[PDB]
Each structure stands twice: as C-alpha cells, then as structure tokens.
Write a protein that binds this ligand. Structure first.
Ligand SMILES: [Cl-]
Length: 506
C-alpha cells in the first residue's frame, strides 16, 4: 500500500442531492453510496455483498428476510437498526416526500397504492421483526431483490436528523450518515470532500482515507487535469479521443461496455411528437453506424431499443426492420411517414434539442440536427443547460427533444421498463401502453425464467415499435484510472464502483 491514500474522482456534473430520497443520477448514487450503506452493497467486481445486512434469505416467493449486523452505526455514534430502514422506505414511498425515484420501492407490498395516495405509508410491506431483523413483502416474486437494496434511494435515513434540520439536513454540519465516509465539505459546482469514518462497522478494512469529487462538465478539461495529476479517476474520455489516449495512457484506459443506453427523450404529449409516425421517422433517419464509428469512437454499439445486448431477463435486444435498409430507402420511408402524419413539405417541423453542457453531447446533438435537416428538412435548434436543470425539464416536459440516458440499477430487464411503464416516476417521456404493462405483469408471474424472458422480450419489442424515445447506442465504460489505483475490475457492468473497494499502491 502507498503511504498516502487520497482519491480524487471526476463526476460529469454537480450532484442533484445527497438525500437518498431525492437521488436520481449516476453521480448521486456514486457519491451517496460512499456516504450511506444499504442492506447490501455492489462491490468492485459488481457482486452483491453484505451491507448493513450480514445475511438474507428468500423465505417465500414474495418474502425476503434480512439479518442486520449488530454493530452498524450512524456518524453521530447512534446505532443503525431495522427501524431506520422502515422509516427510510416509508418516507421514500410517501408522495408528500416528493421523491422522483419511487420506482425502487415500487416492488414492495402496497407501495403502488401508497405512491398513489390511496393508502398511508405505514402500510408499506417492510417490517422490523426486531431491531436486527427486517422482513420485506413484495407485490410479486422478485428473485434478485437484494440487488435493488444496494442502490442509494434504499439506504437508511436518520429520522432525528431529518426532523431536527429539515431541508438543511444534508449540509456538512448537520448530516448524519452510515457509510464508510462522512461528508466534510460541499461546495456546489466546485467540490465535495469526504473523510474515512471511524464509526463505520468495517472501518478496519477501508483503505482510502479521503475522497474528493470534482464536477467537471468538459471531458477535455478533465483529461488535462488527469494528465497533470489533479485527478486519479475520470468519468469517461473525450469523444474521438480513444486513439491518442490509448497510446499515451495505455492500460490506465479501462475499457468495456456498460449496461446503459444513450437515447433521446421525446415529449410524447408534444402536438407533433404525440404521433408515432413522426417519432419513428426521426428515429429511422439517424445513422448510428457513422455516429459510433466516426464521432464517439469509444466502442459504442448502435442501439434501437432500451435493452443493451447482454442484460438478463430478455432474449435479445430490439432490432427494427429498417436497421438493415439502404439509407436512401430509410429516408424515403421516413419522409412518407411525415407526410402521412400531416407534416409534409406543406407543414415543416421545428424542434428545440436540449442537452446538458458537455463536448460529447454537443457533438452528438450537432450530428442529429444535421441528419434531421438534410434528410427530412426537420429543424432542431440546439440548447445547452446544466444537468440538474435538464433533469427537471424532462420531468416537467419543458423540453421537446432532449439528451437522455439510463444506467441499469440492477442486472435485469425490469430496470429499463422503469422508463416506459405507465405512471413510473422515471417515465419522463410520458409513454403509456397498457398492453405493454400487462405483458410485463404477466411475465413476472411466470415461474420459468425462459417463459418470463419471452414475455418481457415481446413487451419490449411492442413498446419500441411505438418509438416512445430514440435509442442511439450502448454506453462505453471507457475511462482513465491511474496505475497506482488498485482494486478496479472490468466486470462491474452497472458501473457502481464505491471508493471503499479501491486502494492506492506503490
Ligand atoms: Cl442506424
């Protein structure tokens, strides 16, 4: 081990919140999971390992038991118990809380009714049998339920701290948390600093003593800082840079694909975008082969639906008929769709295309705009905003076409269905197809995984034929991590890599 154990990690934007109930993003989960620990954790390899729960058991199809360790503590020295989880999950489910991430608790018994305000939060199917024993009842059987409990929004929250401090409870001077690190400094758009916690039950095995998170929007600037030794661990690499970066940094460039999809949000209540024919036309004209081979260049794979190849629970991704058509044929068909929809040359379309400030996103957006102009005569005006603002605008439908992207929360197709299920808190495009939903509910009754998969595949295909959004490609996991950073693996496919699992060598 190295004498010094400070780690500096770059994140793509200012974090939206450090309150587990309001955490929505990759950045929020990465930072929040250093500060809070749930029933389980995802380790450096991507494996689900014990968190506050030392063990768990699938006692019945709809029932899980979690046995908590007895020495889990909050940062103020108070014990962590079953009651803390009951409170946290009820709070998450309560619509008065206003969480945008109710999807994770939705599998729990009665959660839907509670979210809808039909039943009180106390009815939620999580119970403290005793201070160290948790019982969770689910609406339907979920074989992988423990994976979900490793995400930030299901971490416990300290009732007293929230009660005493209200909206200021996550401020460094007020916050109480139970993870391997405690928050020392939070300067928005500047830095977040955290220090190893001596109260964490597994402190003796936590090597990294200080973690610094720097929000840097521009990948090139991030690269410069990495090169200067200001950063040990980047978010990604600049678009089009793989070649020169590989030559200069070699194996520090950690390669792979992620279980994550890059796509354009479409406002489904838009007067034009509400027409499936318009959405489809916009989708079929974009050349994802050129996009990936010439613009992104980091191994990204063209995608036409939400399911990345390799995700458990479906048989295969969605690949539309036209994916293998000559472009000229693609364009003719798409122009005819616009005509059919009443948006021919007599009624030209203009949209605003909003993305979060970043060089890759800008490049992708410029490409889409030119593609749509030259092939369809559709005008997309580019607009860049801060990521936090973009997220809010998508929720509120204040953007028409928007840069979006989803990282799997767990390795099953269900995580991607959170984007298109009627009424889901993360269905921001506003799509609703009851047949798709009923097919999913049916799939989740199947006793056989094969049968389940078939139905989920059918439901996914059915949804994508409606083109509720525009999938572009599968995210590349490529990033730079210094040679002296140990513990990094290439098998963490959802890219949930906690600081406590790494260590500095040399
Ligand atoms: Cl394509």
């Amino acid at each position: 081990l190295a004498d010094q154990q400070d780690l500096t990690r770059q994140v793509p934007a200012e974090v939206e919140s450090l309150d587990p109930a309001h955490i929505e993003s990759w950045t929020g989960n990465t930072i929040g999971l250093d500060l809070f620990e749930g029933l389980a954790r995802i380790d450096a390899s991507g494996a689900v390992v014990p968190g506050v729960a030392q063990a768990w058991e699938h006692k019945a199809p709809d029932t899980w038991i979690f046995k908590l360790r007895r020495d889990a503590k909050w940062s103020n020295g108070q014990p962590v118990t079953a009651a803390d989880f009951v409170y946290a999950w009820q709070r998450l489910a309560d619509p008065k809380t206003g969480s945008k991430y109710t999807i994770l608790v939705e599998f729990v018994k009665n959660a839907s009714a509670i979210i809808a305000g039909k039943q009180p939060p106390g009815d939620l199917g999580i119970r403290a049998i005793d201070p160290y024993t948790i019982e969770v009842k689910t609406e339907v059987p979920v074989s992988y339920f423990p994976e979900l409990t490793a995400m930030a929004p299901l971490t416990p929250v300290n009732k007293d701290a929230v009660a005493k401090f209200g909206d200021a409870w996550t401020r460094p001077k007020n916050i109480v948390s139970n993870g391997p690190y405690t928050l020392v400094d939070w300067q928005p758009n500047n830095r977040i600093v955290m220090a190893k916690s001596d109260k964490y039950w597994n402190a003796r095995n936590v090597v990294i003593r200080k973690v610094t998170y720097l929000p840097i929007e521009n990948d090139e600037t991030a690269l410069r800082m990495y090169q200067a030794g200001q950063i040990d661990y980047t978010y990604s690499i600049p678009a089009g840079g793989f070649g020169q970066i590989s030559k200069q940094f070699g194996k520090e460039l950690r390669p792979g694909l992620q279980l994550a999809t890059y796509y354009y949000y479409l406002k489904n209540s838009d007067p034009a975008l509400k027409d499936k024919r318009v959405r489809e036309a916009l989708a079929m004209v974009l050349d994802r082969e050129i996009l990936t081979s010439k613009i992104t260049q980091a191994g990204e794979v063209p995608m036409y639906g939400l399911m990345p190849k390799g995700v458990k629970g479906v048989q295969r991704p969605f690949t539309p008929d036209w994916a293998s058509w000559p472009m000229a044929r693609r364009v003719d068909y798409a122009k005819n769709l616009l005509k059919q929809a009443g948006h021919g040359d007599a009624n030209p379309l203009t949209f605003t295309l909003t993305y979060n400030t970043n060089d890759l996103h800008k490049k992708v957006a410029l490409f889409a705009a030119s593609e749509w102009r030259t092939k369809l005569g559709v005008t997309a005006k580019l607009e860049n905003v801060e990521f936090k603002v973009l997220m809010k605008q998508r929720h509120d439908g204040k953007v028409q076409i928007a840069r979006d992207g989803w990282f799997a929360d767990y390795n099953d197709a269900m995580t991607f269905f959170d984007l298109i299920r009627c009424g889901s808190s993360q269905n921001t495009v506003g799509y609703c197809n009851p047949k798709v939903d009923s097919l999913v509910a049916e799939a989740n009754q199947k006793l056989d995984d094969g049968a389940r998969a078939a139905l989920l595949t059918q439901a996914h295909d059915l949804a994508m034929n409606d083109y509720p959004m525009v999938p572009l490609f599968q995210y590349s996991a490529d990033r730079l991590v210094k040679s002296y950073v140990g513990g990094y693996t290439l098998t963490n496919y959802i890219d949930m890599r906690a600081s406590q699992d790494m260590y500095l060598i040399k």
